[PDB]
Amino acid sequence: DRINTVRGPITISEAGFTLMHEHICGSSAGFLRAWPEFFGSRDALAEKAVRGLRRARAAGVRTIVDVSTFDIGRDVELLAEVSEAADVHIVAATGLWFDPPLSMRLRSVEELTQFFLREIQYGIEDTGIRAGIIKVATTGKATPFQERVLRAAARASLATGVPVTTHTDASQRDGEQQADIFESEGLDPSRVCIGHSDDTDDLDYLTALAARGYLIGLDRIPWSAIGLEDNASAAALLGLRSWQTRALLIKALIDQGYADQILVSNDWTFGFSSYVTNIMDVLDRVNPDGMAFIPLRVIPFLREKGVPDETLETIMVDNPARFLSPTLRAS
Amino acid sequence: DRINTVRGPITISEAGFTLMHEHICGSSAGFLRAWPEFFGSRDALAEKAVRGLRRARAAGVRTIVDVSTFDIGRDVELLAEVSEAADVHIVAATGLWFDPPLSMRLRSVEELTQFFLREIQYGIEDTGIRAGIIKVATTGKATPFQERVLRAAARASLATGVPVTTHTDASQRDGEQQADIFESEGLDPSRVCIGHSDDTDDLDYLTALAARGYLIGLDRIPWSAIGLEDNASAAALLGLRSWQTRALLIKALIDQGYADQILVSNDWTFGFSSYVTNIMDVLDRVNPDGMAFIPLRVIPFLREKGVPDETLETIMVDNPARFLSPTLRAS
Ligand SMILES: [Zn+2]
Ligand SMILES: [Zn+2]
Ligand SMILES: [Zn+2]
Ligand SMILES: [Zn+2]
């Protein structure tokens, strides 16, 4: 039983403490190769990511899942470089986020399924590195193309057992329509994580998804512009709900009996060209711990609020292993 | 005095018969590297392009200008491969068309100018291949970002002397606004080709641009769905005006005294992933001559209609050389 990482297959027990929704860089296809000076240089970005992953590993992280797709500018060779230098496993993704180019947008469900299967079963580009998760997105009601993408992701998952993870506009309850589409293709909800679910306080929405068997991605816990209310860019990106408000949704779903369905992350990054210039200065001021925020701050905060150690181990170790290890079911 | 090609600098006299607006592949950034099987394979696409360029060279073509940008999926290494194997010079482009990703759309004029200057002055990616033209686009009224792109293209041209060439929606007279923006940055119109100008019959529009000193790109001469009216995709792409209607605009502008300002091409390609599946089967049925259509069919057609050989030489040889060779003026 094995999970594909950017340095090859690992056994389930090697994943350890896992961050299920992270990025080395949030960019666009071809952008890092065409304009590396945007990031200072490719080597500056790699070095920044290695320092950050090493601090995360010191705090207990063993694996991240980089849910950057083709259209997030995923560079699997960069991921393999930083994975080896930090001694942190990195799982890469296939799928499409919400910035696909025309060459993707004009494709049918069947064509997209071929593409996703290429990246899971054969490899990414000419690297032979295989994805271990499928990432998809909506930002409100699905576009016609996004519906095709979710259907293709379901077909790819149904052939390979690799799971699907999503970007939502949680405030618009996108996970409802996502689930509908996935289920119409026969996908088991145990193979799906409805992500950015901590962006909403709506427990009716969150428990309706969890009750039908979805995994719930509380993956933006450090996202907050509190203290920076006069930076419009920062507020628009991060919102004005506190990291504590977000982290308490982890406790809320535990208290409702869904501990085995929660996945927790930071949705952090080391470079970010798909937003305003100099946004990394803001992010690194907001959350200097970066990807170590979950182990260093959230885990202690939940213990202090009464969540048992055994439960926190289930969430950070066992749930990612069960979710990632390929299957048409995971329970 | 020299023009940058994908195999290095050439002197002005080496360009010869030049097609100013062509593509090896119409795609999207990263797409050919991520999904080469879309095109059958990368080698099938390369071989197709070499066969086509060799037939063009046999018909008299010596140079093409591949006006594929970053967001058209320009692969300069593919261009250099096909250039060497066909013995046809290829000039590459910088700039942005109308499918930029978020990592480009969020950039300022100054940032975009740096990017364009990178590709002209330093090189594309890590290849050391330098662009010899800047490509920009609108599709009707400029978006705010497109206005930034046109301003950056003007700044890049003003530093380097490399010209600018445009995509328009000619039916909406986009060249008027393009010219306005370019002139507000101080760009000389002799450094600008307003392209797809044969997509309209409006001579008031065409002569207003030519009178102010623009070059006029009559670059879609073989584009016609006549004979395929029941193929909605094909009609929408190609229109229902004949190649003869288009070619007669070359004569019209000659007759109005603008021979020195006309640039003629095919806007052909060998692969096309940014439109509907199997569109190349349609294009190769519509125009089996491909890029050789201008020398094989248009040049004889204009001679038959009374255009002097000397004038056709001015248009296919001298105008491209004067336009491409770097300068802040070209007259
Ligand atoms: Zn997201
Ligand atoms: Zn993310
Ligand atoms: Zn065009
Ligand atoms: Zn074109």
UniProtKB/Swiss-Prot annotation, chains A, B:
Post-translational modification: Predicted to be exported by the Tat system. The position of the signal peptide cleavage has been experimentally proven.
Membrane topology label: Peripheral membrane protein
One of the record's GO molecular function terms: aryldialkylphosphatase activity
Subcellular location field: Cell membrane
Residues given in the record as Zn(2+) 1 binding sites: H21, H23, K135, D267
Residue sites binding Zn(2+) 2 per the record: K135, H167, H196
Practical uses of the protein: Has attracted interest because of its potential use in the detoxification of chemical waste and warfare agents and its ability to degrade agricultural pesticides such as parathion.
Highest taxon of the lineage: Bacteria
Any Gene Ontology CC annotation: plasma membrane
Residue(s) carrying N6-carboxylysine: K135
Keywords: Cell membrane, Hydrolase, Membrane, Metal-binding, Plasmid, Signal, Zinc
Catalysed reaction equations from the record: An aryl dialkyl phosphate + H2O = dialkyl phosphate + an aryl alcohol
Stated role: Has an unusual substrate specificity for synthetic organophosphate triesters and phosphorofluoridates. All of the phosphate triesters found to be substrates are synthetic compounds. The identity of any naturally occurring substrate for the enzyme is unknown. Has no detectable activity with phosphate monoesters or diesters and no activity as an esterase or protease. It catalyzes the hydrolysis of the insecticide paraoxon at a rate approaching the diffusion limit and thus appears to be optimally evolved for utilizing this synthetic substrate.
Self-association and partners: Homodimer.
NCBIfam families, alphabetized: organophos_OPH
Protein family (similarity comment): Belongs to the metallo-dependent hydrolases superfamily. Phosphotriesterase family.
Protein's recorded name: Parathion hydrolase
Species for this entry: Brevundimonas diminuta
